Design a protein around this ligand. Structure first.
Ligand code: HEC
Length: 98
């Protein structure tokens, strides 16, 4: 559900990945070229990074561990992270339409 994925992305991701970008770390946007260069232009890789995190990208998964590498907010359920990974892949493929 793209409507549902957009809503969840808007509240859990968009402040950092504004319209597909990255306000913290240049080179690590959600655009296809950056995802590709970073080895993560697949739903499975997007899911894994969202779940466990990397660098200053917090992990959101329920079993993300250790505590310090994960969001200090609530964790996301597996189904939510799957929706988000699908949504990011779809948007990146589409070129992040505005
Ligand atoms: C909400 C759940 C999300 C989702 C789906 C993603 N993020 Fe982030 N992200 C942030 C930073 C600093 C990075 C770079 C980390 C590094 O260089 O080691 C990332 C990276 C990603 C990717 C990979 C992008 C790439 O081109 O390699 C993906 C798929 C991704 N994120 C998804 C920063 C943040 C945040 C700032 C506090 C927040 C919030 C999020 N990300 C949230 C999400």
């Amino acid at each position: 559900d793209i409507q549902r994925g957009a809503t969840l992305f808007n509240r859990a991701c968009i402040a950092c990945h504004d319209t597909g970008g990255n306000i913290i770390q240049p080179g690590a946007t959600l655009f296809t070229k950056d995802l590709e260069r970073n080895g993560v232009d697949t739903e499975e890789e997007i899911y894994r990074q969202t779940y466990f995190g990397k660098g200053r990208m917090p992990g959101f998964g329920e079993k993300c561990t250790p505590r310090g590498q994960c969001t200090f907010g609530p964790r996301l359920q597996d189904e939510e992270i799957k929706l988000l990974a699908e949504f990011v892949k779809f948007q990146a493929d589409q070129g992040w339409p505005t």
